[PDB]
């Protein structure tokens, strides 16, 4: 319904999230994924590290620069899942993948925009409690991503700024809800209530 | 003005070009049926050219009809043309390729007099 | 798909006209075709069939 849908990837079950995003992309919706480092994979961290090492040992024998590239960043791991689920060798798949942006953290353009979640991909809703899971930032750091610390620092800064913004917004919302509390027994408000508003 | 006819349906309008006539110059486009034992076209594998078959045959009611609803009749002179005087709504005259320009003028004038349609009235005109 | 119990598009195997191009024989066949159709006469039907027969099927009498 929006021109751009911004998904907060935190705790979003990378494969299920990639399925949702791939279908949206192919249907024609622009998707921006933020906080890719906070994405989750089901299974133990050691399981997923071993899986990525099995991925890492695959490479073109006669020239490793031709073989499958092993992107270490969480955003690029998510992008790998999503690309594997898009028909990326066609022009249609290329257009779909151009309709997508993935980020670690929440960069400036999208830090002041609304973020959504995908309930059918959310870890807390999908995984049975007690099941172990991996965090993409930790997996990526373990397999060679160099910027977990920088992203964490920038995220702490962004969260300070956003908490200040939200304190201001909550104050204003209290003001508005109070001014709406009065004029709730007025004739116009009672007609609105009769009509369902 | 031709006889009324049902809407003309061409079941297959694109030419049946011979297999590999796009691949080799020596292979002409004139349709030839593949006789090869392994021929993917003869075996009719999905994705290959279609072959002419009787199912493509056109409705007998509209067969041989030009888009205007007339059947073409080749005419070489005024006598050939006048074989169509009582059939102007069914047949249209086509002047033969080898008719000279002055004979074409004569034929056109006579066809106009007889209300017989000519399919190629602009052949060998005054340049 | 149909499990055909017999040969499809099988011709009857009987002559329906003379192989001959004799115009007079064809006129006789036309006459006896009319008769066999519009008389209900077994004779007319069998004569129409006999008019189609080849030479070795019409031995001299």
């Amino acid at each position: 319904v929006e021109p751009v849908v911004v998904i907060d990837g935190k705790g979003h079950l990378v494969g299920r999230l990639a399925s949702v995003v791939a279908k949206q992309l192919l249907n024609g919706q622009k998707i921006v994924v933020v906080r890719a480092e906070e994405l989750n994979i089901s299974g133990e961290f050691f399981r997923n590290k071993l899986k990525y090492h099995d991925f890492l040992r695959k490479a073109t024998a006669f020239n490793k620069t031709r073989g499958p590239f092993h992107f270490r960043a969480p955003s690029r791991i998510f992008y790998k899942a999503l690309r594997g689920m898009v028909s990326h060798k066609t022009a249609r798949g290329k257009a779909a993948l151009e309709r997508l942006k993935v980020f670690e953290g929440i960069p400036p353009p999208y830090d002041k925009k609304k973020r959504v979640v995908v309930p059918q991909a959310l870890r807390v809703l999908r995984l049975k409690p007690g099941r172990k899971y991996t965090t993409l930032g930790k997996l990526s750091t373990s397999v060679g991503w160099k910027y977990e610390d920088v992203v964490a620092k920038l995220e702490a800064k962004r969260k300070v700024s956003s908490a200040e913004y939200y304190a201001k917004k909550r104050a204003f919302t209290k003001k508005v809800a109070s001014a709406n509390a009065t004029a709730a027994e007025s004739d116009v408000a009672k007609q609105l209530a009769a009509l369902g508003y | 003005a031709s006889l009324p006819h049902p809407k003309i349906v061409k079941k297959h309008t694109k030419k049946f070009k011979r297999h590999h006539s796009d691949r080799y110059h020596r292979v002409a486009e004139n349709w030839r049926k593949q006789k090869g034992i392994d021929s993917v076209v003869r075996r009719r594998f999905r994705g290959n050219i279609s072959q002419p078959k009787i199912g493509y045959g056109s409705n007998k009611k509209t067969k041989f009809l030009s888009p205007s609803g007339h059947k073409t009749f080749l005419v070489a002179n005024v006598k050939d043309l006048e074989t169509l005087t009582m059939h102007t709504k069914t047949y249209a005259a086509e002047i033969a390729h080898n008719i000279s320009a002055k004979n074409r003028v004569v034929i056109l004038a006579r066809a106009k007099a007889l209300g017989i349609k000519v399919t190629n009235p602009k052949g060998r005109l005054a340049l | 798909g149909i499990d055909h119990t017999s040969k499809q598009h099988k011709r009857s195997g009987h002559r329906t006209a003379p192989k001959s191009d004799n115009v007079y024989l064809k006129l006789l066949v036309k006459l006896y075709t009319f008769l066999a159709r519009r008389t209900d006469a077994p004779f007319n039907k069998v004569v129409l069939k006999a008019l189609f027969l080849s030479k070795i099927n019409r031995p001299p009498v």
């Binding site: 609304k114 959504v116 979640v117 995908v118 309930p119 059918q120 | - | -």
Partner: protein, 172 residues
């Protein structure tokens, strides 16, 4: 093989001049329809007596409805089933409101825990345990304590829409 109904099936071992009025054998067959009910009847009668469908007849078939479909009961169920390596008898207890629901739960449970398909299971007996403290399986007994209450922690509501705007909660 589907949602079950219970049928009484009565068959005859068809009469002759020697034996008129044969001995009218009856069975309670859990089946999803009457064709299967009669098939199972003949299967078990051929396991039991010298008779077959061609030498007998189905005297009657009648669905048996639960007499009290809206009271919770504890059922003891005795089954005989074939594993991959042998045949075994088993006793289980199922809490439900009807024999058909108990038997459906039993078939699901045998498939789930022993990979015993329908064809591999015989329902030896289904009987309501009238007296609690004769319930001998803890997974049923735990539901018979006084004033039984329990929460349903971690509620997961399904979204009608792809995207949500709220970061939902699992409270209940």
């Amino acid at each position: 093989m589907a949602h079950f109904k219970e049928y009484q099936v009565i068959g005859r071992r068809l009469p002759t001049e020697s034996v008129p009025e044969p001995k009218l054998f009856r069975m309670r067959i859990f089946a999803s329809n009457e064709v299967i009910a009669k098939s199972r009847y003949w299967y078990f009668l051929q396991k039991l007596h010298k008779v077959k469908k061609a030498s007998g007849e189905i005297v009657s078939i009648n669905q048996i409805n639960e007499a009290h479909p809206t009271k919770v009961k504890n059922f003891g169920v005795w089954v005989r089933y074939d594993s991959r390596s042998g045949t075994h008898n088993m006793y289980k207890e199922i809490r439900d409101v009807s024999r058909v629901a108990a038997v459906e739960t039993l078939y699901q449970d045998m498939a789930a825990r022993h990979r015993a398909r329908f064809r591999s299971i015989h329902i030896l007996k289904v009987a309501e345990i009238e007296k609690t403290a004769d319930v001998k399986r803890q997974y049923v007994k735990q539901f018979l304590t006084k004033d039984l209450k329990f929460p349903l922690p971690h509620r997961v509501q399904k979204s009608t829409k792809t995207f949500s705007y709220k970061r939902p909660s699992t409270f209940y």
